[PDB]
Design a protein around this ligand. Sequence first.
Ligand code: ADP
Ligand code: ADP
Ligand code: P3S
Ligand code: P3S
Ligand code: MG
Ligand code: MG
Ligand code: MG
Ligand code: MG
Ligand code: MG
Ligand code: MG
Ligand code: MG
Ligand code: MG
Ligand code: MG
Ligand code: MG
Lengths: 443, 443
Amino acid sequence: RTFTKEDIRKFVEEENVRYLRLQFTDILGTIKNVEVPVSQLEKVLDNEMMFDGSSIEGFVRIEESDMYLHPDLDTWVIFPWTAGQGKVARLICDVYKTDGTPFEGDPRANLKRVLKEMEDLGFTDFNLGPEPEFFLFKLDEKGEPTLELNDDGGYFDLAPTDLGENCRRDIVLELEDMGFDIEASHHEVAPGQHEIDFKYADAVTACDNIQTFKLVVKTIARKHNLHATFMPKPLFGVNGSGMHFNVSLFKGKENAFFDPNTEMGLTETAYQFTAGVLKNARGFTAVCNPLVNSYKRLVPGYEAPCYIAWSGKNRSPLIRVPSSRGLSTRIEVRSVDPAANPYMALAAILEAGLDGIKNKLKVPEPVNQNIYEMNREEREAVGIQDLPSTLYTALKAMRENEVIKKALGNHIYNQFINSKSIEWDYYRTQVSEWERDQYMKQY
Amino acid sequence: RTFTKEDIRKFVEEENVRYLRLQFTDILGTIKNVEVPVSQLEKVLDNEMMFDGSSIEGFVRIEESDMYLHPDLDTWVIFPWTAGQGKVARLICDVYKTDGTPFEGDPRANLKRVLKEMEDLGFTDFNLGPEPEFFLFKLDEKGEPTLELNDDGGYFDLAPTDLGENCRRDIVLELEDMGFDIEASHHEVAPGQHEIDFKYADAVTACDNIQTFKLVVKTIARKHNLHATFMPKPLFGVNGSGMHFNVSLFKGKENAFFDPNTEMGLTETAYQFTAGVLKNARGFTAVCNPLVNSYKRLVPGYEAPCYIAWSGKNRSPLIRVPSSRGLSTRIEVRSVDPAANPYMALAAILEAGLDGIKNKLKVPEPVNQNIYEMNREEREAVGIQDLPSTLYTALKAMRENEVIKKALGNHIYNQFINSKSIEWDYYRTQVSEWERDQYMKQY
Ligand SMILES: Nc1ncnc2c1ncn2[C@@H]1O[C@H](COP(=O)(O)OP(=O)(O)O)[C@@H](O)[C@H]1O
Ligand SMILES: Nc1ncnc2c1ncn2[C@@H]1O[C@H](COP(=O)(O)OP(=O)(O)O)[C@@H](O)[C@H]1O
Ligand SMILES: C[S@](=O)(CC[C@H](N)C(=O)O)=NP(=O)(O)O
Ligand SMILES: C[S@](=O)(CC[C@H](N)C(=O)O)=NP(=O)(O)O
Ligand SMILES: [Mg+2]
Ligand SMILES: [Mg+2]
Ligand SMILES: [Mg+2]
Ligand SMILES: [Mg+2]
Ligand SMILES: [Mg+2]
Ligand SMILES: [Mg+2]
Ligand SMILES: [Mg+2]
Ligand SMILES: [Mg+2]
Ligand SMILES: [Mg+2]
Ligand SMILES: [Mg+2]
């Protein structure tokens, strides 16, 4: 069910592939890659491809720059928009040190580490169905983006109110040709916003999917004279974009979250799992919402969470339980946004979830109600805690949580905190057009 | 005949449609749809598939916000401007709740509910032939509509006075290749105004016929560098657009409105029905004219109604009985405008008419003169009421009518009152440039 070096060797000759892209993911969720001519295949498969690690965000220092790429052969895919003499294929890679030690800073591998912990606890797969929503801006004279959305449409609109109809069709086409099992395509709430959904996959595969997804969304958009962006809240007073993380544990072909006995079809594994996410949600939101701009979307009134609670069929809370049951039984962690590093965010959610199982915690009361229309002490009554309000308050929540530190390991944890703290302090000393428009004449 | 799943399956295979487009309508009459690839065909046909009802206007709240779609299979249609590999079929859907119940808030479901009460009183089909007039404006360079109209032509004008022949011929062509029975196209009275008529059909498919028609006109208008608008009165001083509702009852392929033996040629069933339409007109005007702007159409001098009355061959009253008889025999409610939600409006007029049959009401006598040149005191004489003049009074007339509260059921009634009252209380507060032009120098 895994591919061998000779599997890959045959694909390269069958489809007459000309170039290889070796791709991997830094600490910011940003995909990086070098292209080699397929004449270098044997170097690729014997794990002898090198790059400057010091030139990558959350990696090594300049005095130990050299690092290697190790291709995960299962990640093979060919880019259905490439020619015959320019056919390009891809391998996603894990990062290693010169000595053959896998890198403590690799985000993909760190998720592979946390998934071995769920396995020793008796679960065969951790499935994630991501929901990355995006905005489409128009490009100008000289190719750079503008602030003019591509339409003034809204949820489930059709053409011409929704003008990214063709562009979404082109993204489904190339994606389907890449082995994506697409599920739905539609205009989202906010003007210019779009959603394309695809079937869930096992943890490592799902993240690889997100990275591919972004990759295809952005380039096809450019071919439609549009600029795509996964920024959390591009604009005040409209819905932001969130990368909902639908998750579930399988004991093999069977969904450990589903109960065919009860009226709400949830097992107590699932209740325990949701318990852990809720307990540790403060500690992991810096990682699921790692930009300053991520907290301009965690504001009430736009179907994004602000308050740690769970409920079914309810889109105001941090955890919605969608109505589907059966193999589709899942918890939806709505706080995640598309700027998150998927590998790290899923590591976060998984180990928080595994915290609830290993510690057999009982879940709080479902908040079956519109949490926005609740006031500070009406929710303080039922024990509903807030998520961090700023990126600075999110990191502090991180420094004091013990689970996110285990889910990330010491390197990523420190490199993440060190970067984002510098990030905050550049922001914190910016003077906004807001401050000037409100304060330059008045005072 | 009536299509069944495997009928659906075979058409999908035999035609290689790659994409389903599932559509439903919100309270404001606006079409809503999601694209899903044919991968998901079986998830569609098992009514297994969902959307967010709190982001549909006039539907559910965010706490209870998960809803499903049941496709009406008889609505299968392949878009004749989608080639292979990008070929889209459509299915109109009904809307269901998480408990498997139809949604009280579905406007289409509702028309179906009322049509059931029509089968009670012994009628097989309620046919409607709609007449959705529209305007075409010129786009500017960056794609947005301007206030320059496409021609300056009149009723029945030719090219080059009429510069919409070519936009209309393309509309007519796509429409026939979607199965429409087109009956005429021509320039309408106002400059830039156009009409395309088509055969009547049963109530549901006719409202479906209107939604498709609207979507196909706006699409093709863009292809021609135009903006189609179904706004009732886009410009002062020249006719508005109406959506004439031509209706009749059938006792099984027999025009129940046609009496072959009498001179006028109407059965007493047709008379009773008009009595009910005429009695309840004020109560259903808000739903037939839901815009502030709807009421700048409903003003004398423009071939559009403003007084509750009925006449044959006569184009001033609310209701006109056109000369044609036989199976063409119909009443024409001329108040309807194209911003009206088709399903709701038809539900409203269907029950008003039913109100008159069941109670065997008797018809006001016809007003066989140009009822725009009758003085308020001359009209009060014969006992002729006025239509509501503002959306606010129309809402007042609606809150005080019992037939309309039962045509919509409480959810649609309540949702529409609420939404439109708010739409008014913004309008009533804005300062018109009319006001600043007459008053700002004089005072
Ligand atoms: N058992 C499961 N575990 C994790 N994700 C799942 C499971 N079943 C379905 N999903 C995922 O949840 C996603 C949610 O799809 P979507 O239609 O976007 O739901 P909504 O938009 O209503 O939250 C799908 O992408 C699917 O792959
Ligand atoms: N029995 C009927 N019931 C409802 N509509 C009908 C019937 N017979 C004809 N019609 C419809 O009336 C419409 C005529 O519109 P049109 O020719 O524009 O009339 P007008 O003379 O009012 O412009 C068509 O949509 C046609 O299908
Ligand atoms: C209507 S929405 O509910 C959009 C939510 C918002 N944009 C956010 O996640 O921040 N999401 P979904 O795809 O789950 O229906
Ligand atoms: C000549 S007109 O009579 C124009 C009516 C106008 N546009 C309105 O109903 O507002 N309508 P029709 O197509 O029924 O002849
Ligand atoms: Mg070697
Ligand atoms: Mg291709
Ligand atoms: Mg979704
Ligand atoms: Mg969404
Ligand atoms: Mg979601
Ligand atoms: Mg199923
Ligand atoms: Mg006509
Ligand atoms: Mg007309
Ligand atoms: Mg007419
Ligand atoms: Mg008789």
